[PDB]
Amino acid sequence: VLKLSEQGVLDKLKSKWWYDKGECGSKKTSALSLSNVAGVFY
Amino acid sequence: AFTFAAFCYMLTLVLCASLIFFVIWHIIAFDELRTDFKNPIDQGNPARARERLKNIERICCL
C-alpha cells in the first residue's frame, strides 16, 4: 500500500474512477455584462 | 447568447435595407435614363431639349 501511494498509483486510480469516468466536466468579474442590458439594445 | 457580434449583425441588418433602397433607386433612375435614351433623342423643340437636359442633370446630381 505504501509503495503504491509513493508511486502515485492510488491517486491515478482515484482520478480515473472519479473524474475520467464522470458524466460532468473537469473544473469572476462583477462588471456589468451585456446580458444585463440586452433589452435596451433590442 | 447575446454578444458584441450579434449586435453588430443586427445593426448591419438594419442598415442593409438602406443599401437595398439606394440600389433600387439607382436602377429606377437608370431605367428612366434608358427610357429617355432608347426613346428618340430628337431635340428640335428648344423647350423639349431643355427639359430633357435638366432631367438628365437632375438625375445625375441625385
Distance CA B36, CA B58 (A): 13
Check if B22 contacts A (Cβ < 8 Å): no
Torsion of CA B16, B18, B21, B26, to 10 degrees: -100
B15: left (phi over 0), alpha (psi -120 to 50) or beta: alpha
Grid cell digits, residue B51: 427639359
Does residue A20 sit in helix, strand or coil? coil
In the PDB record, what is the listed experimental method?
cryo-EM
- B1/A35 touch (CB, cutoff 8 Å), yes or no: yes
* Deposited resolution, Å: 3.1
B contacts of A32 (beta carbons < 8 Å) = none
Question: Do B9 and A42 meet the contact criterion of CB atoms below 8 Å apart?
Answer: no
Q: Which of A32, A34, A36, A40 to mutate to test the interface with B (most CBs of B within 10 A)?
A: A34
